[PDB]
Design a protein around this nucleic acid. Structure first.
Ligand SMILES: [K+]
Ligand SMILES: [K+]
Ligand SMILES: [K+]
Ligand SMILES: [K+]
Ligand SMILES: [K+]
Ligand SMILES: [K+]
Ligand SMILES: [K+]
Ligand SMILES: [K+]
Ligand SMILES: [K+]
Ligand SMILES: [K+]
Ligand SMILES: [K+]
Ligand SMILES: [K+]
Ligand SMILES: [K+]
Ligand SMILES: [K+]
Ligand SMILES: [K+]
Ligand SMILES: [K+]
Ligand SMILES: [K+]
Ligand SMILES: [K+]
Ligand SMILES: [K+]
Ligand SMILES: [K+]
Ligand SMILES: [K+]
Ligand SMILES: [K+]
Ligand SMILES: [K+]
Ligand SMILES: [K+]
Ligand SMILES: [K+]
Ligand SMILES: [K+]
Ligand SMILES: [K+]
Ligand SMILES: [K+]
Ligand SMILES: [K+]
Ligand SMILES: [K+]
Ligand SMILES: [K+]
Ligand SMILES: [K+]
Ligand SMILES: [K+]
Ligand SMILES: [K+]
Ligand SMILES: [K+]
Ligand SMILES: [K+]
Ligand SMILES: [K+]
Ligand SMILES: [K+]
Ligand SMILES: [K+]
Ligand SMILES: [K+]
Ligand SMILES: [K+]
Ligand SMILES: [K+]
Ligand SMILES: [K+]
Ligand SMILES: [K+]
Ligand SMILES: [K+]
Ligand SMILES: [K+]
Ligand SMILES: [K+]
Ligand SMILES: [K+]
Ligand SMILES: [K+]
Ligand SMILES: [K+]
Ligand SMILES: [K+]
Ligand SMILES: [K+]
Ligand SMILES: [K+]
Ligand SMILES: [K+]
Ligand SMILES: [K+]
Ligand SMILES: [Mg+2]
Ligand SMILES: [Mg+2]
Ligand SMILES: [Mg+2]
Ligand SMILES: [Mg+2]
Ligand SMILES: [Mg+2]
Ligand SMILES: [Mg+2]
Ligand SMILES: [Mg+2]
Ligand SMILES: [Mg+2]
Ligand SMILES: [Mg+2]
Ligand SMILES: [Mg+2]
Ligand SMILES: [Mg+2]
Ligand SMILES: [Mg+2]
Ligand SMILES: [Mg+2]
Ligand SMILES: [Mg+2]
Ligand SMILES: [Mg+2]
Ligand SMILES: [Mg+2]
Ligand SMILES: [Mg+2]
Ligand SMILES: [Mg+2]
Ligand SMILES: [Mg+2]
Ligand SMILES: [Mg+2]
Ligand SMILES: [Mg+2]
Ligand SMILES: [Mg+2]
Ligand SMILES: [Mg+2]
Ligand SMILES: [Mg+2]
Ligand SMILES: [Mg+2]
Ligand SMILES: [Mg+2]
Ligand SMILES: [Mg+2]
Ligand SMILES: [Mg+2]
Ligand SMILES: [Mg+2]
Ligand SMILES: [Mg+2]
Ligand SMILES: [Mg+2]
Ligand SMILES: [Mg+2]
Ligand SMILES: [Mg+2]
Ligand SMILES: [Mg+2]
Ligand SMILES: [Mg+2]
Ligand SMILES: [Mg+2]
Ligand SMILES: [Mg+2]
Ligand SMILES: [Mg+2]
Ligand SMILES: [Mg+2]
Ligand SMILES: [Mg+2]
Ligand SMILES: [Mg+2]
Ligand SMILES: [Mg+2]
Ligand SMILES: [Mg+2]
Ligand SMILES: [Mg+2]
Ligand SMILES: [Mg+2]
Ligand SMILES: [Mg+2]
Ligand SMILES: [Mg+2]
Ligand SMILES: [Mg+2]
Ligand SMILES: [Mg+2]
Ligand SMILES: [Mg+2]
Ligand SMILES: [Mg+2]
Ligand SMILES: [Mg+2]
Ligand SMILES: [Mg+2]
Ligand SMILES: [Mg+2]
Ligand SMILES: [Mg+2]
Ligand SMILES: [Mg+2]
Ligand SMILES: [Mg+2]
Ligand SMILES: [Mg+2]
Ligand SMILES: [Mg+2]
Ligand SMILES: [Mg+2]
Ligand SMILES: [Mg+2]
Ligand SMILES: [Mg+2]
Ligand SMILES: [Mg+2]
Ligand SMILES: [Mg+2]
Ligand SMILES: [Mg+2]
Ligand SMILES: [Mg+2]
Ligand SMILES: [Mg+2]
Ligand SMILES: [Mg+2]
Lengths: 154, 97, 118
RNA sequence: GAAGGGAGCUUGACUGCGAGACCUACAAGUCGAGCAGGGACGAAAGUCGGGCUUAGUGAUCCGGUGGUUCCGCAUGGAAGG
RNA sequence: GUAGCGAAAUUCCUUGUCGGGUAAGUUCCGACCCGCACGAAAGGCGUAACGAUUUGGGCACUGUCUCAACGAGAGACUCGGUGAAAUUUUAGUACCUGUGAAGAUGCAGGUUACCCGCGACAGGACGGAAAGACCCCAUGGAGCUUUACUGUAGUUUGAUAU
RNA sequence: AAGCGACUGUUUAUCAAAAACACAGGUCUCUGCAAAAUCGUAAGAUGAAGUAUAGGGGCUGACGCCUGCCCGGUGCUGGAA
RNA sequence: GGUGUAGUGGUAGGAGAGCGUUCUAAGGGCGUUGAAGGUCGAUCGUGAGGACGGCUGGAGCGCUUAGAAGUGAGAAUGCCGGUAUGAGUAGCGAAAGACAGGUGAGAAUCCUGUCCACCGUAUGACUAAGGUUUCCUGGGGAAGGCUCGUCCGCCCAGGGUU
RNA sequence: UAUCCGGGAGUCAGACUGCGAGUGAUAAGAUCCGUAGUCGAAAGGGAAACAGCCCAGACCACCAGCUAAGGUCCCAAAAUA
RNA sequence: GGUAGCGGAGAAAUUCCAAACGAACUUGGAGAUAGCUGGUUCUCUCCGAAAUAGCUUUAGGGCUAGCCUCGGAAUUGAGAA
RNA sequence: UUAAGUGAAUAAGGGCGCACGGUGGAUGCCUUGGCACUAGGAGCCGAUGAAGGACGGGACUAACACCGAUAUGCUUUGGGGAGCUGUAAGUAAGCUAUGAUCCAGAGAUUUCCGAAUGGGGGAACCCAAUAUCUUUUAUAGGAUAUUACUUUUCAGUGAAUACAUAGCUGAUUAGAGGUAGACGCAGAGAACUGAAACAUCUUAGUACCUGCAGGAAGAGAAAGAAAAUUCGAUUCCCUGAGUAGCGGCGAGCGAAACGGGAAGAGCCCAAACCAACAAGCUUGUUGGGGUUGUAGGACUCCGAUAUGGUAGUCUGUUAGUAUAGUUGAAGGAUUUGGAAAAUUCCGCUAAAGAGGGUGAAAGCCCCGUAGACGAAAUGCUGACAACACCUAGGAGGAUCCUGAGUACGGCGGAACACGAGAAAUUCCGUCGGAAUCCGCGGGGACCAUCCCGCAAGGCUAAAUACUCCCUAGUGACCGAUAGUGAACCAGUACCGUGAGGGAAAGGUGAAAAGCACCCCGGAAGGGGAGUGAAAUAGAUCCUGAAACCGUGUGCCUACAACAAGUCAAAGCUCGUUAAUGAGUGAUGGCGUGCCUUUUGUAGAAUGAACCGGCGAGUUACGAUUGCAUGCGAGGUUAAGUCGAAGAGACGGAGCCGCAGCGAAAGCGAGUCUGAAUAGGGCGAAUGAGUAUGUAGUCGUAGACCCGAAACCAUGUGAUCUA
């Protein structure tokens, strides 16, 4: 704003006589290079909902997936070593081709690594799952242990 | 502001004072006491756990607004005379903690 | 999230200028003069869509009057006679008959005069 | 039919109020039957909360005087409210 | 309120009255004194010399004027070169009378007027230039004054310490 | 020939050069020296390496003739019951 | 959705519903077989506005739903830039130049010569300050020079202060 | 349609005409009230032009019709009724 | 070379102090304050004022009321003619 | 033929439409650079000469960059492996597998000015002294080292003056100055402004100035908070709360404790007393001793010579880490094309589908990324060890010690939210002036009782504040009038005496392939010919709007009074988004611009020369209402911890609501007034709230934008003028 712009202290010309429009500073907002009136300022956009509303939202997305039958539960995801080709074959076996949220229990590092690089796959741990993740994903591929941990969390 | 006419607060006089030793009590009524079972021992801790009284202020005072129906032993900072009569007529008892 | 001027300004002003085609000099070249003139044109256009009805009724009345005089009658007497005779042909059709079908207009005038006599 | 005038006795030129009204931007202003307390006059009815009615007045802050079963910075006092 | 001076750099009434000067003098000079409202160091009165001081008269001198005429040069004017500015709502931008925010190129009625220029003038465009300095207002500003209010530097007086 | 200013000077750079300022002269008053006065919080300076025939301040303004009355009021100066 | 009846001027101002701009998310698309942008057109909607063609252009951009705003200009003697009007107009800044010859693409303006004219207690000759290479030599004629320029205190390259 | 409750205002320069008064001079396009209208914030028709007068309130299209004020010899629609 | 802005200097004019001096210039407080003037950008639909009262160091400002708008509650329907 | 009547066409110029140019630089797209932050690092540099400069160094050298007479660089240790001699072309001359250029660590050199310090001085210049060395036969000349001031310590000399001291000399010691326009503490300290005026008050202990600093600072180990009975240094966050209070009781100002968290750490002296030393039984130095409020300590008795700890150390050893790096998967064809990454067909890779570049849009072409690996040298951190420094229990009180011109009081100021007020508590100046354990201070005047504590001495990490810089990133942040003033040789040009003010200016093309040659011309500039996908991409170079200027012409225009239009319309010309079409338009009707401000403006009231761009109700924190969602007599978490700068989880301290009435004690569906079971007021009967989102309005902030004359505080000016 005009206070922050460089310079602009003195009065450009006397109040009367010159025949020009009266001015106070070369940095006034109407001047080329003058300060900005209002405009963006640093601030936070984040707010918090009531805990009960948060919980209802999470339950709602998960319930919606189940009702549409887009929730695919697998007995377990084990990879001796991380290999994206093997995980891609796993998706094919499960017949999942659209966007998928892969929910893994904590510590399943090989599964997580092998899946993450696939363009349509979003990997999240059962302890860290959010409304946005579930809603974004068209299908939810979850392991049975992950579902157990989710049920405990909620 | 009233454009120079003497504002209302200026017209009106100050009044009263605040007692330094002022004591306010968290109020409880017989209808709320009905939420408990017969023979139950009602206590400030019990009320706080039940969530009926989150802030007890100087203490719990029991009032006789509603009709009590359960026998209870009630412990509180104070009791209104009507409240004590109602509790005791219901077969309960009152103790001034 | 800055929204610079863009092209909406030019688009809007160009619409006004196109509306002002044919005006005299700056009144079609310059946006401010053009807009001021286009507004007056709108005022005149709305006002004239009403005045136009008046003008043509006036024209028809004058032509009917000339034809009635030739047939031995004034415009006013002709219209009074037609109303008596229950003729609902309006002034537009009457003026058209006077200019184009003189015989038909004369027949209308005869019936009007007969009604007046009765 | 006095609200004008005179005489006797008096102090209602009362205390706590006050349904309901008028007036009104507000703050204010005006009228009020009636209830209770305790009275004046009158045999009684009953009248009396000043004067025939309408002017004779000034918000708040601050301070003085009197009363008060109110408060009293650990407690009892006090200081001060 | 003395001396002195006085219609004055002071006299409103006032071009006071009288005399001088002029054919004619609200100015000027001399005098008078009802000094609206002179006056003795914010000096009174007078004064040789001095003054790009103010005032009146005279001689000389003249285009200052009667009353304008001619001539020289620079600009202006034509041509070649170079080439701004203030102003500017758009303008195909008449006159009279009237009307209208009461003073019209633009509105009404009437009149006049072929199209485009060039050299001149300045009546109008309430012409340009400067958000009027006059006037009023703002619970504006600034400089200044004082026996305005409240302070205060200094100056001084007392107690006290050294 | 009259007014004003004695005079030479000085002044509003850029609308006023004058009758305005200065001036020599007059007068009043302060100041005994670390003088008074002034700059400075102070130190330190000017006054002045001067000393009442000197220095500061106020007024008047060459020269000539003169400068009347009032000390109640306000200042200053002195007094001290 | 249909019918009927009624209603629909409007400043300050209140309410409602929309258009368009940039960006984010998601989805679904379009683009060297030509995106955005620009331009023209006789196109659509009740309005802000939306399409579709031709041309230009040469690499990014729509659409639907939701979200966030530096979100819409014609006026502030507004700021910046560009370009007009006045206008081929004012002005071209105290004074004498003439002609012959030369140079050169081009000469009133540069060089040479002759005459003429001007200053001469200066417009001459020295120096201090200040300026700071403007000095000399050879080139140049974009710009600067109030015209012109072959020329210059200008530009280019060398050199010069013992 | 009135109330009452609440959110958001703007307005505190008014003008003229008719009628009733004051001030003024029984002047003012004056001034100050009361009352009605219009303008303000209202386009259209009439009053030559002419905010406030007369008629009349524009959501739009029409080269249809009937009227209001005001008009009908020509400009200029309609009676040389 | 010296004197510097709460200042200097002034033969005194508010006169000079770097082309505007009743208080220099520059930067900062600073986006001073401005009941004052100017400006404030797309569209359509519904409704639509006021220029008054009271009080005001108040009079071209402001506050409450009056007049407008949006939502709501309720009624023995209380409004208008 | 005569007469009467009618009578087109022509354009000196102009208008409209259209087409094509020019000018100019809007728009679109793009980006060298910015903006706001996050994580980590680093938080100082200087007499061992700094920050910042001047002048120099290149084969050519004007500028920038780098370097300093060892000058476009030197040495050394590592990295890297083919070109390299900057910008920056062009020559010219060279270097490089004997490993160059280049990258990182360490080191050498580092002119002159500048605190600048041998002296001087108008910065980058001048002139010296001493000693050694050097040139000359010799003087002159040259090089090197030392030579400021003050402070510390020491030594010698040494006055008035006898001793002395002062001074002087030398040696020794550590300071000066600059910053990072930030943060901290302190001294000094405004005004505009608000209060609708203004003085108390507010702005505000703010801006400015000055001092001192440190990487943080400050505070800090109770003469405390309290009175639930208890807590146990300090700091900071949430909350208490806009409460209690202060206040021309106005405008406004405004806590603290409790509670919840972040982080946590406690220690030294003085004194008593002891030992030694020295002088003059005390009195100073040294060492021991001892350190406190359930009083401690001395001192006297006993018993232990351990047990633990540390906020120490250029002490190593070790690990990790920072400063270069190495490695790192997978595609070919077909169509369009100048060019493929695009299209189409089949593949392949993925712990790598982050990103950037490549002739258009690439997982598989390149640089990269995931992942793996890597350090000679120098820092940093952590451990381990070493060294070092702290670290005693019990019982007695006879006596001694436990901070004096202090605490405190009067007067005058100031700080505490608290403006002298009833005013504690803290501090300053001045004066007066205590007690000391049976003692002293505090618990908001004061006293008594009770409780809590032990001043007048010192030190102390962490949580906290800030970012000039460095490294790695992020963004519903900017995209050349924006974003830093500065994307570009910017604090430059330019302006000013000076302080100081302060710009403008980005884009050819994929690649210069930057138009050989020819032609007009003195050139400039053009036309060909070429390059190119494109030259109307030709360097004023992407796109190329509008104003403005011009060329061509389809229609109209020289009897007309014109806010320039609109309505009606002949004629002429032309044929589209094919529409009851388009351009022009004789002629006729109606008709005084836009805006602002007004009772009223065409107004002869204001604003705009035109065009383009830019240019004004926003955000944060609170209040309140509507709408929406969740829960519902309940609702909800704040700070903080974990987590991607996310969601989310935990966190119930706290806030709102469920009870009101009263000034208050207090009572309570009632309560207050009152003598009152009266009346009346406010409430209940007669219940919905709360968290969040969103919108309207308001408050605090510049608060919709622009505008004063002015006020105040540092500085710069006597080159004009007095
Ligand atoms: K006289
Ligand atoms: K006089
Ligand atoms: K005479
Ligand atoms: K004279
Ligand atoms: K003179
Ligand atoms: K003459
Ligand atoms: K007017
Ligand atoms: K004229
Ligand atoms: K002034
Ligand atoms: K004089
Ligand atoms: K004199
Ligand atoms: K004299
Ligand atoms: K003179
Ligand atoms: K003078
Ligand atoms: K004299
Ligand atoms: K004197
Ligand atoms: K005097
Ligand atoms: K004198
Ligand atoms: K006297
Ligand atoms: K006296
Ligand atoms: K197009
Ligand atoms: K904005
Ligand atoms: K403008
Ligand atoms: K021009
Ligand atoms: K021109
Ligand atoms: K030459
Ligand atoms: K309302
Ligand atoms: K009237
Ligand atoms: K002078
Ligand atoms: K023509
Ligand atoms: K120096
Ligand atoms: K900083
Ligand atoms: K003040
Ligand atoms: K005010
Ligand atoms: K510290
Ligand atoms: K608060
Ligand atoms: K006040
Ligand atoms: K010890
Ligand atoms: K490639
Ligand atoms: K790529
Ligand atoms: K290391
Ligand atoms: K106090
Ligand atoms: K205490
Ligand atoms: K304590
Ligand atoms: K191109
Ligand atoms: K044309
Ligand atoms: K016409
Ligand atoms: K005017
Ligand atoms: K009662
Ligand atoms: K009651
Ligand atoms: K709700
Ligand atoms: K809300
Ligand atoms: K603001
Ligand atoms: K606001
Ligand atoms: K000077
Ligand atoms: Mg500033
Ligand atoms: Mg002008
Ligand atoms: Mg900017
Ligand atoms: Mg714009
Ligand atoms: Mg009609
Ligand atoms: Mg007490
Ligand atoms: Mg107490
Ligand atoms: Mg006379
Ligand atoms: Mg005479
Ligand atoms: Mg006199
Ligand atoms: Mg005198
Ligand atoms: Mg005199
Ligand atoms: Mg000419
Ligand atoms: Mg008139
Ligand atoms: Mg007229
Ligand atoms: Mg006209
Ligand atoms: Mg005019
Ligand atoms: Mg004028
Ligand atoms: Mg004015
Ligand atoms: Mg004189
Ligand atoms: Mg003289
Ligand atoms: Mg002058
Ligand atoms: Mg003069
Ligand atoms: Mg005098
Ligand atoms: Mg209507
Ligand atoms: Mg775009
Ligand atoms: Mg904007
Ligand atoms: Mg503009
Ligand atoms: Mg002319
Ligand atoms: Mg000349
Ligand atoms: Mg001479
Ligand atoms: Mg020369
Ligand atoms: Mg030459
Ligand atoms: Mg020339
Ligand atoms: Mg009037
Ligand atoms: Mg109005
Ligand atoms: Mg009308
Ligand atoms: Mg009007
Ligand atoms: Mg009819
Ligand atoms: Mg007719
Ligand atoms: Mg007749
Ligand atoms: Mg004066
Ligand atoms: Mg000057
Ligand atoms: Mg301020
Ligand atoms: Mg309406
Ligand atoms: Mg008042
Ligand atoms: Mg090597
Ligand atoms: Mg030196
Ligand atoms: Mg004020
Ligand atoms: Mg440090
Ligand atoms: Mg690879
Ligand atoms: Mg492919
Ligand atoms: Mg205080
Ligand atoms: Mg004291
Ligand atoms: Mg005390
Ligand atoms: Mg204790
Ligand atoms: Mg710390
Ligand atoms: Mg810029
Ligand atoms: Mg651009
Ligand atoms: Mg700039
Ligand atoms: Mg092109
Ligand atoms: Mg171009
Ligand atoms: Mg004619
Ligand atoms: Mg003609
Ligand atoms: Mg007016
Ligand atoms: Mg104008
Ligand atoms: Mg100076
Ligand atoms: Mg000097």
């Amino acid at each position: 704003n005009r206070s922050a712009v460089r310079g602009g202290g003195r009065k450009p010309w006397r109040q009367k006589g010159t025949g020009r429009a009266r001015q106070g500073s070369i940095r006034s907002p109407q001047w080329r290079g003058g300060g900005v009136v209002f405009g963006p300022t640093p601030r936070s956009y984040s707010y918090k909902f009531p805990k009960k509303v948060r919980r209802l939202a999470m339950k709602s997305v998960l319930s919606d997936k189940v009702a549409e039958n887009n929730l695919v539960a697998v007995e377990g995801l084990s990879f001796d070593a991380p290999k994206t080709k093997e995980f891609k074959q796993v998706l094919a076996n499960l017949s999942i081709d659209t966007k998928v949220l892969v929910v893994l229990e904590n510590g399943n590092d090989f599964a997580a690594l092998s899946a993450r690089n696939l363009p349509n796959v979003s990997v999240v741990t059962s302890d860290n799952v959010s409304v946005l993740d579930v809603v974004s994903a068209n299908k939810v591929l979850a392991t049975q242990t992950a579902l157990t941990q989710i049920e405990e969390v909620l | 502001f009233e454009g120079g006419q003497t504002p209302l607060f200026r017209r009106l006089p100050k009044r009263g004072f605040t007692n330094i030793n002022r004591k306010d009590y968290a109020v409880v009524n017989l209808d709320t006491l009905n939420r408990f079972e017969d023979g139950t021992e009602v206590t400030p801790v019990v009320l706080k756990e039940a969530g009926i009284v989150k802030n007890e202020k100087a203490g719990i005072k029991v009032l006789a607004d509603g009709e009590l129906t359960k026998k209870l032993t009630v412990k509180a900072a104070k009791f209104s005379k009507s409240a004590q009569e109602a509790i005791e007529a219901a077969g309960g008892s009152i103790e001034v903690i | 999230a800055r929204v610079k001027g863009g092209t909406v300004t030019r688009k809007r002003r160009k619409k006004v200028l196109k509306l002002a085609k044919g005006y005299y000099g700056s009144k079609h070249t310059l946006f401010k003069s053009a807009k001021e003139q286009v507004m007056n044109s709108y005022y005149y256009a709305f006002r004239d869509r009403r005045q136009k009805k008046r003008d043509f009724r006036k024209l028809w009345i004058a032509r009917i009057n000339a034809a009635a005089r030739m047939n031995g009658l004034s415009y006013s007497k002709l219209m009074h006679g037609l109303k008596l005779a229950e003729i609902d042909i309006n002034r537009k059709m009457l003026a058209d008959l006077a200019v184009n079908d003189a015989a038909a207009f004369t027949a209308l005038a005869e019936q009007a005069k007969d009604a007046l006599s009765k």
